[PDB]
Design an enzyme around this catalytic site. Sequence first.
Site, PDB file in Angstrom:
ATOM      1  N   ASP B  75       0.858  -1.186   0.000  1.00  0.00           N
ATOM      2  CA  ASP B  75       0.000   0.000   0.000  1.00  0.00           C
ATOM      3  C   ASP B  75       0.891   1.232   0.000  1.00  0.00           C
ATOM      4  OD1 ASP B  75      -2.413   1.461  -0.059  1.00  0.00           O
ATOM      5  OD2 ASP B  75      -3.067   0.851   1.923  1.00  0.00           O
ATOM      6  N   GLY B  77       0.603   3.940   1.945  1.00  0.00           N
ATOM      7  CA  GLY B  77       0.963   4.339   3.277  1.00  0.00           C
ATOM      8  C   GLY B  77       0.117   5.361   3.967  1.00  0.00           C
ATOM      9  N   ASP B 236      -7.403  -7.895   0.459  1.00  0.00           N
ATOM     10  CA  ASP B 236      -6.478  -7.943   1.581  1.00  0.00           C
ATOM     11  C   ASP B 236      -7.213  -7.580   2.868  1.00  0.00           C
ATOM     12  OD1 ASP B 236      -6.115  -4.800   1.099  1.00  0.00           O
ATOM     13  OD2 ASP B 236      -5.248  -5.262   3.049  1.00  0.00           O
ATOM     14  N   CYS B 273     -11.486 -28.433   6.613  1.00  0.00           N
ATOM     15  CA  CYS B 273     -10.228 -27.755   6.366  1.00  0.00           C
ATOM     16  C   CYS B 273      -9.094 -28.735   6.103  1.00  0.00           C
ATOM     17  CB  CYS B 273      -9.847 -26.857   7.549  1.00  0.00           C
ATOM     18  SG  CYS B 273      -8.281 -25.975   7.303  1.00  0.00           S
ATOM     19  N   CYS B 275      -6.011 -27.927   6.240  1.00  0.00           N
ATOM     20  CA  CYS B 275      -4.733 -27.399   6.726  1.00  0.00           C
ATOM     21  C   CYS B 275      -4.009 -28.331   7.695  1.00  0.00           C
ATOM     22  CB  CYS B 275      -4.961 -26.026   7.361  1.00  0.00           C
ATOM     23  SG  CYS B 275      -5.172 -26.022   9.150  1.00  0.00           S
ATOM     24  N   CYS B 278      -5.224 -28.653  11.029  1.00  0.00           N
ATOM     25  CA  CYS B 278      -6.454 -29.446  11.119  1.00  0.00           C
ATOM     26  C   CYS B 278      -6.128 -30.911  10.848  1.00  0.00           C
ATOM     27  CB  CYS B 278      -7.544 -28.895  10.198  1.00  0.00           C
ATOM     28  SG  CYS B 278      -8.317 -27.396  10.869  1.00  0.00           S
ATOM     29  N   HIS B 304      -4.143 -21.756  10.714  1.00  0.00           N
ATOM     30  CA  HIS B 304      -5.455 -22.231  10.289  1.00  0.00           C
ATOM     31  C   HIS B 304      -6.228 -21.150   9.540  1.00  0.00           C
ATOM     32  CE1 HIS B 304      -9.449 -23.779  10.067  1.00  0.00           C
ATOM     33  NE2 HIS B 304      -9.882 -22.684  10.663  1.00  0.00           N
TER      34      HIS B 304
HETATM   35 ZN   LIG Z   1      -7.446 -25.896   9.430  1.00  0.00          ZN
END
Ligand SMILES: [Zn+2]
Lengths: 337, 337
Positions: B75, B77, B236, B273, B275, B278, B304
């Site tokens: 960005d 700023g 974002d 999930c 991940c 997980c 996560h």
């Molecule tokens: Zn997860």
Amino acid sequence: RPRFSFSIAAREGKARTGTIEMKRGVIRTPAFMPVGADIILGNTYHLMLRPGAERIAKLGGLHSFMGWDRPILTDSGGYQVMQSEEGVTFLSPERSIEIQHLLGSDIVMAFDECTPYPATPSRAASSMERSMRWAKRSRDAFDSRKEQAENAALFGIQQGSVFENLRQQSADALAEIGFDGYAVGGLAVGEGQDEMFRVLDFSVPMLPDDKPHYLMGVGKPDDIVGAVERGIDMFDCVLPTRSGRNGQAFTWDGPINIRNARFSEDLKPLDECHCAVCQKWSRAYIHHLIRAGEILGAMLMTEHNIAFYQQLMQKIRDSISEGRFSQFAQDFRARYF
Amino acid sequence: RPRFSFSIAAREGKARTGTIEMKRGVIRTPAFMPVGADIILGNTYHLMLRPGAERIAKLGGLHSFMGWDRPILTDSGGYQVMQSEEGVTFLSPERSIEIQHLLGSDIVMAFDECTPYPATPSRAASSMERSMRWAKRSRDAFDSRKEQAENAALFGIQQGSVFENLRQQSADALAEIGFDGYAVGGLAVGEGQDEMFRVLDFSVPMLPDDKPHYLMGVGKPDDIVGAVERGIDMFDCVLPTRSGRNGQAFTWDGPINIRNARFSEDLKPLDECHCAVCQKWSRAYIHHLIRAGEILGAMLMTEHNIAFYQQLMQKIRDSISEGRFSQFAQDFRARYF
Ligand SMILES: [Zn+2]
Ligand SMILES: [Zn+2]
């Protein structure tokens, strides 16, 4: 594997390297046991308070709870806690062993009294005497629980403060009861390294040579090298993880405080270190993250310190196996200080 | 790859999925850009203060500093900072572009004014008018730096508050200058989701269809799904990482506060999930770590949430590609709320 088997593969002076075989895995010695590596430590005192030992057992025991299928050592909880011959209110040999059983740990510590420092002879003796009676109570409680007796191991803990004659009496008492391993208790309580090494010089040979020797709460890298020189096989200490959380990193050149402005443009990795942090990031960037208050920084630092400690233990094992531990110790010392 | 190329591979309603090709890598859209995934965000405002943009350039630029070789967006700023036609004291189009050049970012944001909410028509207009003059100054400064002009991309940022006619004027101004992509600025400043979606309904079609559309600062999972429905390609937000640091986890069933006592015996993983957290740990154990104040807990939670956001974006991309984004949105909503 067997429930418990300790074999010594090589020696140099008082130093030993070998393995402990247990049902959940092999532990290479000398071993550093990080807090929850071939074995980790659980936090008995915390766990009995939250969520409770029974709740942990309800959730499947500590291995499944923390997703660690390898051995786990638990302390007996009193060190942390700290009173009558029965135990302590705020725990007793029997309850401590029960809690460790519910947690499902592989190496169980006897319930002892960690004698304050300094201590007079009389106080040290009264205290060690109670600890040896609690050690016998610990053994009996352990042996009364089939699953524990057949699958776990029990270590007894030597007390006696800094007094040779009390350390001897304590070693004798413990050997008469009989344990799978023998811890040196009552040190790393403010006596300083010279005094600790002095007590270790006479105390470790009093323990059965053919069983593992655990120095509880030790320590700094140089404390570990000196203790291995004196016959110790196992170590635990929160220093890597506390240090990690406070800006300090271990290196072969000594510890560094990464927050210091001197690191702000240092593109070298934290340490030689083979760790993943050191594979990818600079002192300058970890300095930045920590000064920024980012969790990642704290994380990277801890990972580094844990890995440093395991690399140190691997260097110690290899050097004893190769017959060059004496030289390693001197070289270590030259550079670290 | 080229300096910058945006290609749209599939459409459903106003929603699009495609890719941005840049020298350092390909970015799949719709994209979530986590703070420093196909692209990450650097923190211009922080970095210019510590260690300074020049010091970062001295250390090799942000890619080498943070060990990330893929694209980086920064960005401009001022959002963060927040005054004259020149800029702000506490930064100006020229200095902002210079700082982003020193940082070495791949996607550079024009220096704008993020108009406060609420704003009257007159104030919103004066503000948007200054931002469009700064946008032209940003373009000229970017183009004056060869390495930047040839290797980076520049996005302009639409302002105008919630007013259709000002959003139109701003879009016109930006398109006349010409940018690689177009951000929708001035939202996620307290107006609420209904108002944000209302402004997006008319504002996104005003931007060049053949360039990426970035909604700055957005947002919650349901905000992202709705914004993609309205033609946004890039997002974002610090929410995943803040949330992670405060006990809150995103799941397909809605966010959960893992510190709540309801999770203390919950053996399910945080979320479906895929991940790594997980893959290995229970709600009960992460609950424990966070209640214990352990850094690992905070760490696992953040990992996560980051992964959840990327799985959401992947689901969005696949569903648009497959022509079932409309159904996905409805199903998402049914379960999440
Ligand atoms: Zn997860
Ligand atoms: Zn390292």
